[PDB]
From a paper:
The γ-tubulin ring complex (γ-TuRC) is an essential multiprotein assembly that provides a template for microtubule nucleation. The complex is an asymmetric cone with 14 “spokes,” each comprising a γ-tubulin molecule supported by a [name]/3/4/5/6 subunit. [name] is a cell cycle–regulated protein that is important for γ-TuRC localization and microtubule anchoring at centrosomes and within mitotic spindles. We found that the C-terminus of [name] forms a tetrameric α-helical assembly that contacts the lumen of the γ-TuRC cone and orients its microtubule-binding domain away from the complex.
Numbering used by the authors:
A (entry chain M): 533 to 800, 838 to 899
B (entry chain m): 1 to 448
C (entry chain N): 241 to 253, 277 to 663
D (entry chain n): 1 to 457
Write the structure that this text describes.
């Protein structure tokens, strides 16, 4: 009541745990222009303003503690942020806290995370470790959404190829398929974050906060909620998070190549430029697919060890056509 | 910002379908027929800007353009409850009122005559859209006006936003029923042509399939034309849901179609919905299971595209995304997958990555769901080629017979020849062939 | 605290078991009641809220119409040497502006407390250096509106009045230039001088008006409203005193009237002085251009009238004198334009440096002054500090 | 002393627009239609003295002069509830009631015929003003009477008050409706001429944008001229609010136009307002986002000014004054102008400091605002000349064809020649050249004939 623990948890779920998926979609749509800038040129305050405006325009406005929710632009990429979060519970926490920001120019869309202002006594429960884990999960999901947005941008540029003759669009076909593969990867990562991370972690947080018996019990429940959110957002596994980040980077490069090739095909040497762009997009798609296949292989191993039909259903959601299943097996 | 969708309404049938689509979108977003946000629409998680544009600081207007060659339909729109939904500058009525005479070429020539008004409508909707993704044209392929004007609208949407994605839900005419509109096969070809050339994803809505769904799933013995238009609007809604309902994934039309459209030519999508219910059949909340939903969506009788039962060709989906809402048991999903595999109810593309994306969203409080748990699938499926190939063959059969061309010869576009009909038939044939290829590994070389 | 509140009201307005706690709660309750009664007495007897409203209207420039009318009336007077100002005359001018503006609609108890103060008149001083609004605080309200608080309020009043006087001087210069363009349309060679005067006066008016807006609204009006709300919410006389002192200190700091903002205040004063210099130069240029235009118009009219009378329109001697006058006017017009451009550039440099200091100032009102002075980012293009302040801090707090 | 504004009402349409403007100002200041302060109007924080003068300690009388060549509108004003607001001695009605016949020259001749009464009203209002800022001319550009009489009033205000600022609210004709007044372009050209030469600040309100908004937003198939004129009057009111609603800055008309008018010749201002809402659409409280607001502001359908595409002039802002109405923080207005600069929505002079001045004012408690947040931008932008240049070119096209000139040939100003039309075209050309110069460092020399001749070569 006095520290509004349940309100703070609902605000964190809406913003930090990405439970309000429309809010995150709106924020990334608003911040995409800033995220196209180099990380050094990105103004974190602009991304924060876009986040708060999406929150106020989305159902995250219904959180009574939403005004305590702030946007945090992580100084490190999703892979480095995930590694830092994984180090938080490890003796490397001091090393990761002092770890220089990842030289990889994170997009503002990929660097975007929420922070949550917790008043006493709830600050006993929403500790700095929990806030950092929520920020890492947010940054990971935001990076996935950035990759999705880049694939969508490539798709928009390729829509004009439908007006060109098949023969004139042939060199775009490789770029269009690369863009499709990148979009499928990004969308499946987002689907994981939404239906396996965001919703389950928000429900777990609300249930644990509802079952707390004391302030130390509340702290334990909040820490468990944060750890669950970090784990399900792939932030607790540094190899999975590194593979996902590499796949998203390759997907973004593929999408940019595909967009260039589709622009040349729409303009159409231009066909040669489009075919070269398509080949580069296909190579980026191959690298992204390889990292995604390694992630899928690890997920398959986990599903096979515990006989968890749930995880097999998750895999079937991510690999409905079996494109990544053969690549993971390979 | 939401990915706004501009609705192009062509001819009497197309304008009725567009009006019902905009009504359904308003109901899902809690927008009144007058453009006012309903008090019950307290879940601010919906993207109203996807289907509506702001005309002023207070009035939200549907992004709908009403185009007809006959004044009756435009006057009916201006006399409908949706009269305030549409931008009055987005309503083009032919002064001559003569319509297209059920001639696709006449409808196209009227679209050319109303080109300025339609492109002004598209530009006004785009400027009112913070992040306009593209235009979705809702029309019928069987008439004269809705087909030709629909193709014109698709052309103008492609012209104005050439770097933006354009997804369409294009209803192709039934090719197995003898159309009283003898030029319908030409009209169907022109509509499939426009969907192939200017849309990035085309959800084929076969009025034969709509009637089949009403009979088998909605228990409607005689589906009315209004019921067919509402089925087409439901198909368009299901195909556009990822643009209209923002979530973690598929938040833009280009993002939605990217996973579905592997190549620019293989853009002919088939749709399926389950459970399908008629507006009158709301009474019985059917406990539809995930297995029942997936089976009916894969069933041609419940699919909003009428593919024949080909026993020889393994027609397949290029990609399918199912957004499922409600109570779902993992064990029921597992049993559903087992039964689907045993029955081979769905074939997937072999040539590219495809998956079911899942976004979890709260439901609209303003839209009554007849199902405790419902789901929409948007899919690119090669069985839509069977509609497009049949439409192309019928077009060629009519053009070779010069059937109903006298009504088109009244319009300048068809005064000297019917070359536009033959080009439309060829484009629809190429679209069918590319969509069929997308079920096969060789889709990488489709159109070479 | 109880006895202190009682003294303020007078001068300004279990025991067997736990003896230590048996009376503690009773003592605290009695203290609270006594302090509340003292504060209520101070409010009822000293009209603390009415004095605060008067301070807001006059010293915090809350009566914006009154401040506007005072500055407009003072512009022709405040440009004169202060040594010729009569305090009685300045008070009469203030009263006239009140009667000519919405200040006349203020209550007589409020209006009687709003006054014009003349500082010690020195030769060469302008009215901007000596004009201030004041608000007399006495009795219990003087416990909240202390001498420090009253000095801060008067400082903010004087700063806003000086800035508004300079703004209105430059606005009158520009108005004269623009209006005389119609007269000088028949003297197109002189139109450019008037336009240059208008541009320089417009820049000076923009600077002074933006500084005045920041001081009077972001600092003075907001701090006055906060003081009044705190006093209305005050539970005791000491709480009211502390809240009013904090409000006055905040107003002084954000209006640059505090001790720590003294460098910012000096830079703002130098900007205002350069704006007044630009205004005066523009007014002189426009006056010269309008006089030349009027002479040309009179010459043209006399020529037309003589032609209508069938006389030779101008004598060769008169025509040579007219041509010489027009030549001298045209040659002074480029000179007037150059002088106005030089004055504008000096003013713009001073304003840019003041805006940079303001944007780097800790006071938020000074950052708002910089943002207003560079609304089109002219000063932001010229003063790097206005560009950096908004961009730099927002990035650091997003990294934790 | 307050900066008083004299209202000049010209012709039937102009006098009706002026009357409705004065009614709106009275309502915003809590002045009854008879000019008496209502007993409930105890909030003395409004600046009535900007637009109204006090006849006695209690009665505020509008500084308005009503001039028409047709008696219908003046009689309708005297039969309206606002009949007592205007000085009856300041109302001139032509005995013939015939109007100007949609002839600009006839309107000018009527202004000349009513010169004495109008200038007597203006002088009486100025003498009652301790520090009179200037005259505001209310007229229509589409008729015959209001344009010529408005130009006459502007000329006489410039002649009589050469040291005072002259702000104008200049209504540009609707371009989407077919005007029945075929000679409207001559009237529009003469009005733009007078605003360019004799006004110190002209807020251009293009009725075409009002009609576009009425069509797209109000679902009005055929927007009437009256709705466009009322939208234009609303735009002018919003642009003048900082003069009419005193605040920390820009509390006077000369102070208001100084920040808006960079050069004496480059005095043609363009306006923009956001969010724009119709009075009727109060019903739907739209959850408008800042992103949605900013996006709608950039849409021409929501902008209350239809600026033409000038292809010749690299238009820029000469000066900007922002009149903000409602609950406005000066720091928030400043941040808004800053954001406008970041988007480069206005280019400013490079040779001196120039900005958007921001005044924070309280809103009238008595006037219901249909918009939670509103803002007016006043800017001097050379692209506003494209409307005036087009009006001048159309005027010249009609005069060269003698179209509708028979109504003008009845008046002495046009009996022998059409020199008034050519002078209007020349003044508008000089205005275009000065506005283009005001985009340049040479704006110091803007309006000099050497620059008019260098921009016309």
């Amino acid at each position: 009541e006095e520290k509004e623990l349940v309100a703070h948890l609902r605000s964190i779920k809406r913003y930090f745990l990405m439970d309000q998926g429309d809010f995150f979609v709106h924020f990334m749509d608003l911040a995409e222009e800033e995220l196209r800038k180099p990380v050094e040129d990105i103004t974190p305050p602009r991304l924060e303003a876009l986040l708060e405006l999406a929150l106020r325009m989305s159902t995250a406005n219904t959180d009574p503690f939403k005004d305590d929710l702030k946007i945090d632009l992580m100084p490190h990429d999703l892979i480095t942020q995930l590694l830092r979060v994984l180090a938080i519970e490890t003796k490397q926490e001091k090393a990761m806290a002092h770890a220089d920001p990842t030289e990889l120019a994170l997009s503002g869309l990929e660097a975007f995370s929420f922070d949550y202002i917790v008043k006493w006594p709830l600050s006993l429960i929403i500790n700095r470790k929990a806030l950092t884990r929520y920020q890492m999960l947010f940054r990971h999901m935001f990076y996935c959404k950035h990759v999705e947005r880049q694939l969508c941008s490539v798709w928009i540029s390729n829509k004009t190829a439908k007006q060109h003759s098949l023969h004139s669009a042939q060199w775009f076909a490789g770029a269009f398929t690369l863009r499709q593969r990148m979009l499928n990867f990004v969308q499946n990562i987002q689907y994981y974050m939404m239906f396996e991370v965001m919703e389950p972690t928000w429900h777990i947080l609300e249930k644990n906060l509802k079952s707390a018996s004391n302030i130390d019990d509340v702290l334990g429940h909040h820490t468990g909620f944060l750890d669950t959110c970090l784990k399900d957002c792939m932030l607790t596994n540094p190899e999975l998070l590194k593979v996902f980040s590499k796949l998203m980077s390759v997907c973004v490069m593929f999408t940019n190549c595909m967009q260039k090739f589709t622009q040349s095909m729409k303009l159409d040497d231009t066909v040669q430029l489009v075919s070269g762009f398509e080949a580069t997009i296909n190579k980026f798609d191959k690298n992204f697919s390889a990292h995604l296949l390694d992630l899928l292989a690890r997920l398959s191993i986990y599903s096979t060890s515990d006989c968890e039909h749930g995880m097999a259903s998750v895999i079937s959601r991510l690999d409905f056509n079996g494109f990544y299943t053969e690549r993971l097996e390979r | 910002m939401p990915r706004e969708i501009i609705t192009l309404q062509l001819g009497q049938c197309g304008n009725q379908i567009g009006f019902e689509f905009w009504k359904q979108l308003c109901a899902e977003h809690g927008i009144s027929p007058e453009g006012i946000v309903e008090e019950f629409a307290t879940e601010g998680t919906d993207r109203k800007d996807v289907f509506f544009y702001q005309a002023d600081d207070e009035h939200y207007i549907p992004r709908a353009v009403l185009l007809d060659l006959e004044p009756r339909v435009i006057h009916s729109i201006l006399n409908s409850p949706y009269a305030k939904l549409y931008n009055p500058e987005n309503i083009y009525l032919s002064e001559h009122g003569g319509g297209a005479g059920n001639n696709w070429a006449s409808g196209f020539s009227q679209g050319e005559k109303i080109h300025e008004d339609i492109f002004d409508i598209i530009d006004r909707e785009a400027d009112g859209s913070d992040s306009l993704e593209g235009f979705v044209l809702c029309h019928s392929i069987a008439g004269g006006t809705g087909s030709g004007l629909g193709s014109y609208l698709l052309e103008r949407l492609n012209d104005r936003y050439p770097k933006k994605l354009v997804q369409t839900y294009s209803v192709f005419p039934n090719q197995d029923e003898m159309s009283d509109v003898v030029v319908q096969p030409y009209n169907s070809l022109l509509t499939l042509k426009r969907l192939t050339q200017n849309a990035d994803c085309v959800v084929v809505l076969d009025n034969t399939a709509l009637n089949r769904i009403a009979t088998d799933r909605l228990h409607i013995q005689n589906p009315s034309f209004s019921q067919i238009n509402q089925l087409v609007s439901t198909i368009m809604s299901a195909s556009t849901t990822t643009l209209r309902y923002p979530g973690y994934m598929n938040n833009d039309l280009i993002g939605l179609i990217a996973s579905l459209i592997p190549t620019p030519r293989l853009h002919f999508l088939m749709t399926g919905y389950t459970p399908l219910t008629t507006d009158q059949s709301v009474a019985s909340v059917r406990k539809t299971t995930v297995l029942d939903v997936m089976r009916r969506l894969l069933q041609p009788k419940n699919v909003m595209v009428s593919t024949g039962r080909d026993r020889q060709t393994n027609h397949c989906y290029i990609a399918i995304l199912n957004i499922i809402q409600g109570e779902v048991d993992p064990t029921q999903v597992h049993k559903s997958l087992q039964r689907i595999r045993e029955r081979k109810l769905a074939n997937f593309i072999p040539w590219g990555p495809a998956s079911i994306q899942v976004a979890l969203s709260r439901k609209s409080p303003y839209l009554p769901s007849a199902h405790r748990v419902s789901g929409l699938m948007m899919a690119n499926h090669t069985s839509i080629s069977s509609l497009f190939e049949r439409t192309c063959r019928q077009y060629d059969k009519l053009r070779k017979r010069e059937a109903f061309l006298e009504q088109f010869r009244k319009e300048d576009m068809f005064k000297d020849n019917f070359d536009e009909m033959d080009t439309s038939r060829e484009i629809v044939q190429q679209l069918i062939d590319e969509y069929h290829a997308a079920t096969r590994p060789d889709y990488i070389s489709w159109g070479t | 605290l109880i006895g202190k509140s009682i003294n303020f009201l007078h001068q300004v307005c279990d025991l067997f078991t736990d003896l230590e706690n048996a009376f503690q709660g009773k003592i605290d309750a009695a203290y609270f009641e006594t302090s509340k009664y003292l504060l209520d007495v101070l409010n009822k007897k000293y009209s603390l809220l009415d004095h605060m409203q008067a301070m807001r209207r006059y010293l915090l420039l809350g009566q914006g119409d009154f401040i506007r009318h005072l500055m407009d009336l003072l512009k022709p007077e405040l440009v004169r040497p202060a040594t010729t100002l009569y305090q009685h005359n300045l008070t009469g001018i203030l009263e006239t502006a009140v009667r000519a503006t919405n200040a006349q609609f203020d209550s007589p108890e409020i209006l009687r407390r709003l006054d014009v103060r003349l500082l010690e008149v020195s030769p060469g001083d302008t009215g901007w250096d000596v004009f201030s609004l004041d608000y007399h605080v006495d009795g219990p309200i003087a416990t909240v509106f202390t001498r420090e608080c009253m000095s801060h309020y008067l400082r903010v009043f004087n700063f806003l009045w000086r800035a508004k006087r300079m703004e209105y001087i430059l606005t009158d210069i520009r108005k004269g230039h623009m209006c005389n363009a119609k007269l000088l349309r028949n003297m197109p060679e002189f139109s450019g001088v008037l336009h240059q005067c208008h541009i320089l006066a417009s820049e000076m008016v923009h600077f002074i008006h933006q500084m005045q807006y920041y001081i009077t609204f972001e600092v003075l009006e907001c701090s006055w409203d906060e003081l009044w709300n705190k006093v209305q919410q005050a539970q005791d006389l000491d709480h009211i005193i502390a809240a009013h002192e904090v409000f006055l200190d905040t107003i002084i700091s954000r209006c640059l009237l505090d001790s720590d903002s003294r460098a910012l205040l000096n830079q703002l004063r130098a900007v205002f002085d350069q704006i007044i210099e630009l205004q005066n130069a523009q007014d002189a240029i426009y006056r010269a251009a309008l006089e030349e235009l009027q002479r040309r118009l009179q010459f043209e009219e006399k020529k037309k009238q003589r032609e209508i009378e069938g006389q030779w329109g101008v004598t060769a001697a008169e025509e040579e004198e007219e041509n010489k006058r027009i030549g001298e006017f045209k040659e002074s017009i480029p000179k007037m334009c150059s002088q106005l451009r030089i004055l504008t550039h000096f003013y713009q440099g001073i304003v840019q440096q003041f805006l940079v200091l303001l944007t780097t100032s800790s006071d938020e009102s000074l950052r708002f002054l910089s943002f207003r002075l560079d609304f089109n980012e002219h000063y932001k293009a010229r003063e790097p500090r206005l560009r950096v302040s908004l961009g730099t801090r927002g990035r650091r707090s997003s990294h934790t």
